[PDB]
Design a protein around this ligand. Sequence first.
Ligand SMILES: [Ca+2]
Lengths: 100, 243
Amino acid sequence: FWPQGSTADGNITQITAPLVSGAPRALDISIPCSAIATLPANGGLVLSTLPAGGVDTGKAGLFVRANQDTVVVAFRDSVAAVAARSTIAAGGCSALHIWA
Amino acid sequence: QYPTYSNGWSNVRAFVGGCGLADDVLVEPDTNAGFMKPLDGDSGSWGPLGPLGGVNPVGFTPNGVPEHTVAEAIVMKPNQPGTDYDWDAPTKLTSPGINGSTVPLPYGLDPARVPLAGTYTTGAQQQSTLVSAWYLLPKPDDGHPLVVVTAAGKIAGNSVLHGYTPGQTVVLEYAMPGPGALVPAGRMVPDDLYGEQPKAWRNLRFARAKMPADAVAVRVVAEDLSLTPEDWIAVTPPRVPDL
Ligand SMILES: [Ca+2]
């Protein structure tokens, strides 16, 4: 489960768990929109299952990138849930729900 | 596969004067003729990409091709024997084009008369799209049997020796005469030969005999929904060769 840490002032921490078989069996994720409405301008990496610095981590993992004007929920380089960023930070949505 | 070339038909056709394959192969000299003109009489919505871009060409850019992209080949490190000059030519042009591109075009296409549109960037990929303008279509004939679009990138189309070779989308939809709106009426999947070589300037071809007799216009449609840095697309306007 996650968040399982805290680093001494709220601030849930990342974790590392390199799975041997690659993909998991189930991936119920959830993110509130009061948490996506707090990124700065140009946003960046709301959540991920791989670090964005590795070798070809785009076509392997899951990336929720909040760029300017949009929040794109990709997959193995296959967009699933583009959503505008002016209705997220307005009370238009409730929670981003991912499942695999 | 008849009345076209076959061994048994050629052997007996060589009695009354036959040249083998030199009769069934058509060649296009001066591949700068046959370019159609946009039906849309609007110099408005067409932005910095021209009539090839159309309305909201988001994702596409004139300089959207990698560096050593050549016609029907892939450049490698050491000097290979029997290669074209476009393996060694300068990587850019010392002038812009009609769009504003500095990409060397293949087959002898004049970069001062032929625009371009590509979806190759470094960093911050996205989902592209392009819907060209309505290109008028001449009256049919027997000597002009196909429509051609010179394109590079990862494209999905049929061929012999390979089933489907999936990829991105170029479909050249067409229209039929009506009250004056020219709504689309169909789509066509290209016939490319260099499907397993995704960077080759491969000259896609659409047979004219498949679309209906009274077709007024056509237009290009390209998607590129893949965010991989090596899944890109590039296109030029359609033309009717002379053959
Ligand atoms: Ca792409």
